Design a protein around this ligand. Sequence first.
Ligand SMILES: [Ca+2]
Ligand code: NA
Length: 269
Amino acid sequence: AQSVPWGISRVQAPAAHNRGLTGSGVKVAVLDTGISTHPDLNIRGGASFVPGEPSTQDGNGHGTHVAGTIAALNNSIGVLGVAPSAELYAVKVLGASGSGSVSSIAQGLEWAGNNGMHVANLSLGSPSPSATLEQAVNSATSRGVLVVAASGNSGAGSISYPARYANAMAVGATDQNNNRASFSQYGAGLDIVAPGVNVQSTYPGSTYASLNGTSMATPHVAGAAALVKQKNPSWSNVQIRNHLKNTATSLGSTNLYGSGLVNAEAATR
Ligand SMILES: [Ca+2]
Ligand code: NA
């Protein structure tokens, strides 16, 4: 039996699926700890930028979980992603502890731009600005990639990097009441929010796990972008970003919520 996690329903992904929009033909790079083989995922390729770790398999779990929120397969098992037909690429930029470097993240963004990815999901952050990170975001954006990044989990009224940079779409987290989750960073630069509490998804060992974080909100938006790209294959990264914001359900102050809750039904109408 397949379950539909609450966040997938909350962003109205099944309504888009009923229109025939699943993310087919859209290339999504997951810049994370890797992605492990799993019966409910189909991984098309990828690359590792972590020294001495040549495989894209996930030694942590975080990247596999993020990947399943984007693209867990629509079948009779497991869960269901926002964009179950998206082409997933594992770009390993974080080590098994969840730590990375600016150099590994920047190289992953360069790879995404050079390999024609449509969306890059960055469920990660750094507390300090880095010109190398900013340049890599700008370079990927100029090449055509939509960069989607987590606002961070510190609870503070500023958002992490690279989400804070203008050319990254910054995603915060909501709970089941459509309130901002207490940990979700907010403030200047926040674009949109998505479910980020008690998110069930794929996990290494052919299993499933529930996690909390802005890391879990971000892939709902990356998946929604893939649905919009399938419907509108000529649209640019900037057009998709603005359309997601324009069709979001407002939740109140833009300082706390950005444009509001991502809505895949409204975005694909
Ligand atoms: Ca499934
Ligand atoms: Na931003």
